[PDB]
Write a protein that binds this ligand. Structure first.
Ligand SMILES: [Mg+2]
Lengths: 733, 747, 487
RNA sequence: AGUAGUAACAAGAG
RNA sequence: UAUACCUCUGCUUCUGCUAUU
RNA sequence: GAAUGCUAUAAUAGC
């Protein structure tokens, strides 16, 4: 009977004519303005004000209540609280000693349901507690700044949807209009309502505690091969720029996160195996020692029913039933017939801009599925042909059509893009156009249906068409039909191609996606030289480090045998981060320059170190015998992943003053490992192949020659070269 | 002997790699003393010093001395110039619109659709705002309330509709009112009967008297900006002036910024609004592309850039042009709505702060001369510096103690929109089809121009051009602070790039201190700051582990809560030591209860109360987490008259459990001496009305309640139902129900 | 329009760019070398390298600050008793008699058997704490009528020259001691290898600092500024004797209470954060102020006896200074511990960097050296014109010291210098990187740096050290002049 | 005095 | 003037905008 | 094989 007291208090409050007029005039909206009304100025230096205020006699304010009066005025000659009442709480003020007293001899209240209220946090601890710690590793880590989830959620919803759920749990009467959401989480609502039922914690706390484990805390962080929230929460202990810590959390890990990581592992294995002779040899070697979190890759590929080309290639390589089951987020396909050729093309979209997308050629048939609904899809290069489906759920049917329309990459689908569609992220990062178009049309479907066009429904036995509203209609969507009706032993080539028992291929290493991405769970390669599956900068730094480590021998062995120490297992790894279409050309150039340093006496140890790794890929010279000439050697990844031939670069630069070689920001001393003559010995000689310095810039020869103009000379012709700003050199063939 | 030189580290380590050692953030930041009128007047003089060659006229609205540099004579020298050429500002924006097709209308749309949803309470989240009723700064939430209460008296109830637009309509209507009325409390004595000798007691009561002001006096107050000095301004010798704006003009600025934000978010070179890792990512990506795009044989050069007199030079009328050009496709009402904010700023008035203090050393007397009485004393009685300042102020001065200030943005009012005008300069890229190509980044005044050209002599021709291009937008590049080098290393917003943005631990060191919220919070914040630094600011595990120790000391000294087994004497320590002896599970005690610190790298992210809960004594936790403890202040669960001035419970980032250590400090009672006393009653009234409303609607604490109907109407209906259903269910009796319906009947 | 306006604009408007050359980089703040200016005087709150703590071995468990300060003098009674003022140095506008009377009042009050450390408001104590020296507020109406009442000419920081004592501080604060001061509390048990690496790594870093002079000074500065703030609020309207105390542990592992002197705190009705409270410092020292007289113009010194510093009977002086502090400075004093982090991090960066190159934990390697790698050495300082190499542990401590001096001499003069010089440091690093830097108005750049160099000791010494290093780098550059030059 | 440093505090108020 | 060797006060002696959220 | 966009009383950055 709290009702009576409120009505009684309202009559008390309404006797104050100043209060009356506030209640009469101030609207429910304006409550939000008068709630924040205060005298208090915002404390700009709270750190100080606290440090100071803690030296005062009564810095805290109690709430005027029977409990406040259970604190005594003094304890063993300690003034615990004063009679003076705070302006704010309108209750007695007290010393910090009051808290300490209460915590020691205070009344013992009931803490029932506390753990159920603060479950979110207890799980956070349970994960750390039931975790297992591996080894720390010292070496370069390329951290990438990505928008990640900070805290595991019970169930993810938009703040709007999430807010409406909490209302149903805590404040039923003051919920407002019943939304669809109300039904969708009826299990969660009831579950939480039953769990928080017999608690004495303040509803406002319970409200934020649920918000904490329903609303997503998603922020940019520097991560490296760990994205799963239960990893991100520990991110501080997982790695730094120059070290890494293996950590297996507790509780449970999702099959979806297990999947998306399991792909990255396989892609990373294949991307590296490609470069070696007998790729299948290495592919098997690594895959048998690849662990995803605590689970071996082989067990993971066996357990999970899904994953891309790469997963199937490795499955075959290990000897497991290859599942040709694909996923497009909500859509899940299984190929019956066809062969897809992903070619990058410039697509015009409805709003009127040009987006670069990978478009698949060939007629292909798949078993499309979406929840309870099932179907068969037939598509060709940017055209959906035919789509058969079952009549399951009205929304699961509606989604499958939209998903299948987008998946097909139909020119009609791109025409129906009217509104703001972001392919590029706020931080200028790429978002998967096909996966953004999927996400866009799932919300705004009426535009796609109208922009597609209708026709006559089928008049067959069990075939009857459906319209926009998803009802048995006369007009159906152009090539959509509804029905009443719902492997083979492969072998894998050492060069990684899946051949049928006939001879036709189904997959190859050339069919896997080139996009490297952050694994959801932590990938570990239990083989020595795990660095080989690293990033560009990691591989680059680890290679040159290995060159510097063995420089003593490697430099001597070169002055004896020519091509003996070009084939090295480190330089193989290093190849897998070179563009394959320039790998050969670079080796052609590097070897020529290296031999040119040996044979003509004009050595340069910094240059030797820089180029030696590029001398692995079988050489690719021009048609006229002479090697290709270069200013810079671009590598896989960002526009700063390149090695300059004449200058230094963000990956590699040598300071002769200090004799300090810088490799991705890490400094290494070449003191001792350097000849006496080199200091004065020019670089101009080890900059072009079959080109050596004669004198200094000769104005008669004119401006500095380009790579092309240099390549298109005849032996014994002089030329003006610029190594770096303010070092003109005169070089001859 | 042997003479140590700390600069000799830079021989072994490059400056960027050890930049941290160049930031003295263990040291005290510079704070202001006394008046800011000197610093304020300087701005007012300088703003006009850069516009003096422009068109000078008298405002027939305010009567103020207006100066207009726009479309003015181009500069003859490199002294800061405000003489921006409209045509050049437009051309720059047209190129930007061509490079970013539909962006302007795309933003304008979202900015407009937002405004339609935006409520009035939006204005109650802006720190200290200038209140025109009392002509003093006040909390945003109060400054608004005083404007809504005052508007009602002038027959302006647009506020009540709840949307921002109809409230804004009332603000530009209030300028048309011949006189503006507003409440101003006066004290009144009243005899009250008491257990007293004389048999009574006199006590002063507040009484809302209706004050009036003229059309002009009000307009000037609407266009008024209050001025301070910037305290804790790091890495600067001499102080600078800052300005707070009126609740009138705050409304219209929100939309013009919200517009510019939408534009900036979808620009390649915008440093705003992106921040921290998002910004580092964007700039890291931007540098990489503009680096690799450099022509072979050519030279890529990065100009580490800063702009001088950014506020003093940037003109409102140019910002007006920008809104007009950006909203071109928007409906006529929204084109006008945006136009207001720059219009107010082009007629704005700068308040000169406290004034100047005059003293006699012989007599040992001091007196504050208020700004209105600045020219009350002969200028020989002011010091050399101030004399000149006042002489140069003379022709921009208003007798009420204010300064006309038509030119200039004022400190940081249109950051987003200035960033756009900046980017717009970077959008040109080339002039006269010369052998160079510029492209940069812009975050307010701070900019990093990249120039790819054939030789560094050509690069300079490009920079020299960019410089001259900016001069036409009123953007003056700092020749003293700006510097140029070959691309590979640069500085942008105290982020130091050297083949990748380097770690600068020193900058965020101050955040490692005891935050000063309270015990339960400061622990969480304390550990969360370390955790977050280990990630972002590259703090190694040893330094991270030390950063715990150092915190846990500062905490124990600050909250006077040393280990129970320590022999540190103190008032709290006496009971802390008794708790230590009384308690069995001592590892279960929180640090604040003289407990032992159990934090390390791995558990930084767990609440202390949750870490120790398992190994607490039941009696100890039973106290520590008492549901109705008096330190935090919960609900009644009983209904006497429990109505304190409880502010709205916020949603802070730090994760900590609500227990006895989650207390609040007593309010600064300096107010009890001054006549401002009155406001405590006004507060403790609203408090009563809200606190009760929250007892009727529990969801009000969590989510903002919506309705243009009366609070009383809402409360009445709810209680009426509550009573009926309480009766019909059987929670309430007939005798009680009769009383319920009888009492509710009286309303 | 842009083309049209740029076409018609005066050629006088330009960035006027010039390519930077070493020779263009002249020395910053040449006035600091002008011998006509005064030597910058010691203006710190407490003594540092000139400090002298009276050692008093404790039971190990603490007591009241009066009780320890008493028992500390009880041991060194010969000093505590010395009642005859043997004046050596006097501060221009000081009062020998009053200051000595005050010292004696402190010693007596702290030595007595009473609970309180309160001081009677004597004629001397009042002069010392600046009783009623504030001007009287009057009406602007009355103020305007008075012609003799005027706005005062702002007092400016005067220009000073370089002072050896600043160099000598760094040098001595950098050096190792037998004594550990730091009060670093407990940590949770280690589990994750990262924590085991951190913990072991600390043993090298923390100790190297804990066993150096700079540390003790910092800890003293903190622990004082704590009790000073605690009093300032608690005993607002009382003159109070606060002892300058500090706990220290020797290599043998024995706790010693260290009394460095006595301070008196004037009335502290501190409303504003900037509002000042007069603190009068009486500090023990072995330093003869007659040696470097230009260092101590702010100090009044009394010879108060002698002590065995080892086999040597060193005379003990008493440095008396009327000083001042405010809420902010006191607060930032309690947060001076964070000098550890700024110094520690910067080197842990080097250890972690070097660790990635070698592939193991290079912590132990960098300090001492291992089987593979010889110890890390840094260009540390100079010795009759020639560069000197020093330890990783030294290079660490030299930063920790710098970070302490950043606090101790932390004002707006430093902030401005640090920020503006950082701009020139980067222009140098460019020349070093051979990134061919350009400048637009170098003089303007310099003036901004040089206007900050006034009376701050650390700023004046930093300008000397900068100018010194610049000259060394300018020499180093020569090596690069003739590289890939053919000849 | 001193702190400090372009202007203040060295208590303010009934 | 008086109460007043009393009483009250220690960011309220004007602390802004935009981002990291 | 991608996303999910926000919105503190601290601190930093620029004005
Ligand atoms: Mg600037």
């Amino acid at each position: 009977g709290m009702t009576l007291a409120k009505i009684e208090l309202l009559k008390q409050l309404l006797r104050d004519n100043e209060a009356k007029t506030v209640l009469k005039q101030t609207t429910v909206d304006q409550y939000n303005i008068i709630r924040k009304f205060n005298t208090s100025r915002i404390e700009k230096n709270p750190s100080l004000r606290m440090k100071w205020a803690m030296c005062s006699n009564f810095p805290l304010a109690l709430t005027k209540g029977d409990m406040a009066n259970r604190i005594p005025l003094e304890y063993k000659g300690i003034q615990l609280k004063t009679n003076a009442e705070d302006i704010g709480t309108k209750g007695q003020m007290c010393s910090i000693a009051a808290v300490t007293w209460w915590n020691t001899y205070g009344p013992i209240g009931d803490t029932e349901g506390f753990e159920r209220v603060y479950e979110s946090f207890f799980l956070r601890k349970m994960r750390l507690d039931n975790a297992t710690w591996g080894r720390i590793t010292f070496g370069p880590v390329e951290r990438v700044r990505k928008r990640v989830l900070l805290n595991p959620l019970t169930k993810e919803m938009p703040p709007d949807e999430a807010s409406n759920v909490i209302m149903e749990i805590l404040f039923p009467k003051e919920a407002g209009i019943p939304r669809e959401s109300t039904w969708i989480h009826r299990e969660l609502i009831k579950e939480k309502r039953e769990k928080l039922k017999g608690t004495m914690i303040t509803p406002i706390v319970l409200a934020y505690m649920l918000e904490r484990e329903l609303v997503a805390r998603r922020r940019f962080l520097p991560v490296a091969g760990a994205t799963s929230a239960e990893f991100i929460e520990m991110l501080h202990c997982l790695q730094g720029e120059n070290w890494r810590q293996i950590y297996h959390p507790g509780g449970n890990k999702l099959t979806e996160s297990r999947s998306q990581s399991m792909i990255v592992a396989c892609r990373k294995i294949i991307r590296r195996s490609i470069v070696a002779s007998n790729p299948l040899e290495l592919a098997v070697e690594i895959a048998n020692k690849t662990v995803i979190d605590t689970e071996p890759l082989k067990s993971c590929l066996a357990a999970i029913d899904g994953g891309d080309v790469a997963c199937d290639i490795i499955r075959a390589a290990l000897g497991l039933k290859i599942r040709q089951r694909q996923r497009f987020g909500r859509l899940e396909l299984k190929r019956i017939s066809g062969r897809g050729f992903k070619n990058d093309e410039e697509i015009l979209i409805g709003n009127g801009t040009i987006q670069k997308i990978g478009i698949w050629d060939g007629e292909e048939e798949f078993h499309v599925r979406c929840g309870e609904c099932r179907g068969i899809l037939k598509k060709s290069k940017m055209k959906l042909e035919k789509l058969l489906i079952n009549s399951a759920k009205k929304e699961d049917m509606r989604d499958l059509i939209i998903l299948c329309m987008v998946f097909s990459q139909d020119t009609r689908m791109f025409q129906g893009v009217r509104g703001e569609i972001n392919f590029l992220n706020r931080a200028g990062q790429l978002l998967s156009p096909m996966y953004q178009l999927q996400r866009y049309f799932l919300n705004r479907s009426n535009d796609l249906f109208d922009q597609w066009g209708y026709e006559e429904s089928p008049k067959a036995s069990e075939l009857h068409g459906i319209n926009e509203s998803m009802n048995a209609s006369d007009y159906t969507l152009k090539g959509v039909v509804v029905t009443r009706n719902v492997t083979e032993k492969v072998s894998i080539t050492k060069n990684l191609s899946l051949i049928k028992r006939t001879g036709e291929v189904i997959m190859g290493a050339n069919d896997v996606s080139e996009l490297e991405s952050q694994a959801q769970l932590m990938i570990t390669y239990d083989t020595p030289k795990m660095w080989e599956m690293g990033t560009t900068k990691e591989l680059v730094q680890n290679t040159y480090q290995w060159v510097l480590k063995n420089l003593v021998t490697l430099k001597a062995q070169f002055l004896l045998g020519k091509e003996d120490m070009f084939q090295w297992d480190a330089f193989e790894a290093f190849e897998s981060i070179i563009p394959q279409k320039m790998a050969g050309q670079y080796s052609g150039f590097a070897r020529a320059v290296l031999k040119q340093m040996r044979d003509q006496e004009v050595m340069k140890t910094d240059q030797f170190i820089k180029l030696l790794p590029f001398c692995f890929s079988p050489p690719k010279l021009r048609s006229n015998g002479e090697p290709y000439q270069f200013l810079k050697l671009v590598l896989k990844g960002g526009g700063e992943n390149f090695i300059e031939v004449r200058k230094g670069s963000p990956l590699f630069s040598y300071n002769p003053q200090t004799e300090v070689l810088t490799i991705c920001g890490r400094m290494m001393s070449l003191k001792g490992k350097i000849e006496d003559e080199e200091r004065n010995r020019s670089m101009g000689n080890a900059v072009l192949a079959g080109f050596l310095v004669s004198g200094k810039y000769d104005p008669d020869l004119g401006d500095f020659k380009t790579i092309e103009e240099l390549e298109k000379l005849k032996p014994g012709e002089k030329a003006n070269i610029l190594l770096y700003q303010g070092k003109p050199v005169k070089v001859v063939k | 002997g042997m003479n140590i030189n700390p600069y000799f580290l830079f021989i072994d380590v490059p400056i960027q790699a050890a930049i941290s050692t160049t930031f003295p953030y263990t040291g005290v930041p510079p704070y202001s003393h006394g008046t800011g009128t000197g610093y304020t007047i300087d701005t007012v003089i300088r703003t006009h010093e850069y516009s003096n060659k422009g068109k000078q006229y008298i405002s027939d609205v305010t009567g103020c001395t207006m100066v207009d540099p726009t479309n003015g004579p181009l500069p003859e020298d490199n002294e800061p110039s405000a003489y921006a050429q409209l045509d050049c500002v437009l051309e720059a924006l047209d190129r930007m619109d061509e490079e970013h097709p539909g962006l302007f209308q795309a933003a304008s749309q979202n900015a407009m659709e937002t405004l339609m949803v935006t409520t009035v309470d939006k204005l109650t989240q802006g720190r200290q705002t200038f209140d025109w009723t009392v002509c003093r700064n006040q909390p945003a939430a109060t400054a608004l309330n005083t404007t809504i209460t005052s508007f009602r008296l002038n027959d302006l109830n647009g506020a009540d509709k709840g949307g921002l637009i109809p409230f804004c309509q009332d603000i530009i209507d209030s300028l048309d009112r011949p006189e503006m009325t507003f409440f101003s409390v006066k004290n009144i004595k009243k005899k009250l009967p008491a257990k007293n000798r004389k048999g009574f007691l006199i006590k002063r009561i507040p009484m809302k008297v209706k004050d009036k002001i003229t059309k002009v006096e009000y307009i000037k107050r609407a266009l008024s900006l209050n001025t301070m000095t910037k305290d804790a301004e790091r890495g600067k010798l001499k102080r600078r002036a800052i300005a707070t704006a009126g609740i009138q003009i705050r409304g219209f600025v929100l939309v013009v910024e919200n517009l510019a934000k939408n534009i900036c978010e979808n620009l390649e070179q915008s440093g705003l609004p992106v921040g921290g890792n998002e910004k580092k990512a964007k700039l890291s990506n931007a540098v990489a592309k503009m680096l690799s795009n450099c022509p072979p044989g050519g030279i890529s050069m990065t100009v580490t850039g800063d702009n001088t007199k950014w506020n003093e030079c940037l003109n409102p009328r140019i910002f007006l042009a920008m809104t007009e050009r950006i909203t071109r496709d928007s409906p006529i009402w929204f084109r006008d709505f945006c136009s207001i904010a720059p219009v107010l700023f082009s007629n704005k008035i700068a308040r000169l702060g406290k004034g100047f203090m005059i003293t006699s050393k012989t007599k040992r007397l001091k007196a504050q001369i208020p700004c209105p009485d600045l020219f009350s004393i002969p200028l020989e009685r002011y010091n050399e510096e101030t004399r000149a300042k006042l002489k140069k102020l003379k022709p921009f001065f208003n007798e009420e103690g204010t300064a006309s200030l038509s030119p200039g943005m004022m400190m940081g009012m249109f950051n987003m929109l200035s960033t756009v005008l900046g980017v717009a300069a970077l959008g040109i890229k080339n002039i006269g089809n010369k052998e160079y190509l510029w492209d940069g980044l812009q975050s307010s005044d701070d900019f990093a121009l990249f120039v790819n050209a054939k030789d560094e002599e050509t690069c300079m021709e490009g920079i020299n051009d960019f410089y001259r291009t900016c001069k036409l937008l009123g953007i003056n590049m700092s020749k003293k602070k700006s510097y140029c080098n070959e691309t590979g290393m640069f500085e942008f917003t105290s982020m130091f790039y050297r083949d990748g943005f380097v770690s600068n631990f020193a900058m965020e060191l101050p955040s490692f201190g005891v935050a000063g919220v309270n015990e339960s919070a400061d622990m969480a914040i304390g550990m969360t700051i370390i955790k977050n630094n280990m990630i972002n600011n590259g703090m190694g595990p040893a330094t991270a582990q030390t950063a715990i120790q150092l915190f846990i000391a500062d905490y124990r000294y600050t909250y006077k809560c040393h280990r129970g087994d320590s022999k540190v004497e103190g008032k709290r320590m006496k009971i802390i030591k008794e708790l230590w002896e009384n308690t069995k599970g001592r590892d279960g005690l929180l640090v604040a209860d003289g407990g032992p610190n159990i934090y390390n790298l791995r558990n930084l992210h767990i609440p202390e109360i949750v870490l120790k809960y398992n190994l607490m004594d039941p009696e100890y936790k039973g106290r520590l987490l008492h549901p109705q403890n008096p330190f935090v202040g919960h609900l009644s669960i009983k209904e006497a008259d429990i109505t304190p001035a409880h502010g709205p419970v916020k949603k802070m980032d730090y994760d900590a459990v609500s227990g006895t250590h989650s207390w609040r400090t007593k309010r600064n009672r300096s107010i009890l001496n001054t006549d401002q006393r009155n406001m405590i009653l006004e507060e403790q009234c609203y408090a009563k009305c809200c606190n009760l409303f929250e007892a009727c609607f529990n969801s009000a604490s969590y989510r903002k309640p919506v309705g243009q109907h009366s609070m009383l109407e809402a409360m009445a209906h709810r209680l009426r139902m509550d009573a009926r259903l309480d009766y019909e269910s059987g929670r309430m009796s007939k005798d009680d129900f009769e009383k319920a319906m009888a009492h509710l009947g009286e309303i | 329009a842009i083309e049209r306006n740029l076409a018609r604009m005066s050629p006088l408007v330009s960035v006027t760019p010039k390519k930077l050359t070493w020779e263009d980089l002249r020395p910053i703040g040449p006035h600091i070398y002008n011998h006509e200016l005064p030597e910058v005087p010691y203006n710190a709150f407490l003594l540092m390298s000139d400090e002298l703590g009276l050692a008093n071995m404790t039971e190990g468990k603490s007591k009241k600050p009066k009780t320890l300060a008493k028992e500390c003098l009880e041991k060194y009674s010969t000093l505590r008793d010395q009642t005859d003022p043997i004046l050596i140095m006097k501060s221009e506008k000081a009062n020998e008699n009053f200051l000595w009377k005050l010292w004696r009042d402190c010693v007596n009050t702290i030595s007595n058997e009473e609970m309180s450390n309160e001081l009677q408001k004597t004629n001397y104590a009042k002069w010392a704490t600046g009783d009623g020296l504030t001007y009287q507020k009057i009406m602007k109406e009355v103020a305007i009528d008075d012609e003799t009442m005027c706005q005062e000419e702002p007092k400016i920081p005067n220009k000073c020259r370089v002072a050896a004592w600043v160099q000598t501080e760094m040098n001595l604060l950098s050096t190792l001691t037998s004594k550990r001061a730091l009060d670093l509390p407990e940590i949770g048990p280690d589990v994750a290898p990262v924590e085991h690496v951190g913990s072991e790594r600390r043993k090298y870093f923390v100790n190297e600092i804990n066993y150096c002079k700079a540390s003790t000074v910092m800890m003293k500065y903190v622990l004082f500024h704590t009790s000073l703030l605690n009093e300032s609020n608690a005993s607002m309207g009382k003159y109070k004797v606060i002892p300058i105390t500090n706990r220290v542990v020797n290599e043998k592992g024995e706790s010693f209470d260290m009394l460095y002197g006595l301070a008196v705190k004037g009335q502290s009705h501190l409303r504003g954060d900037t509002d000042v409270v007069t603190v009068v410092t009486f500090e023990f020292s072995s330093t003869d102020p007659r040696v470097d007289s230009g260092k101590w113009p702010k100090y009044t010194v009394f010879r108060i006896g002698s002590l065995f510093v080892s086999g040597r009977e060193k005379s003990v002086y008493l440095y008396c200074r009327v000083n001042g502090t405010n809420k902010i400075q006191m607060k930032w004093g309690m947060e001076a511990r964070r000098c550890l982090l700024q110094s520690m991090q910067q080197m842990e960066a080097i250890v972690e960097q070097e660790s990635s190159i070698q592939g193991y934990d290079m912590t132990k390697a960098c300090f001492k050296g291992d089987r593979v790698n010889s110890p890390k050495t840094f260009s540390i300082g100079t010795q009759e014109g020639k560069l000197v190499k020093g330890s990783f542990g030294k290079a660490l401590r030299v930063i920790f010291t710098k970070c302490l001096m950043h606090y101790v001499f932390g004002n707006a003069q430093l902030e401005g210098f640090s920020a503006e010089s950082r701009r020139l440091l980067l222009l140098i690093q460019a020349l070093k990187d051979r990134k061919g830097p350009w400048v637009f108005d170098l003089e303007g750049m310099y003036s901004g740096i040089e206007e900050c160099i006034s009376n701050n000791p650390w700023v004046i010494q930093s300008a000397y050290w900068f100018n010194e290093w610049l000259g060394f780098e300018k020499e180093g550059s020569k090596v690069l002049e003739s590289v890939d030059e053919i000849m």
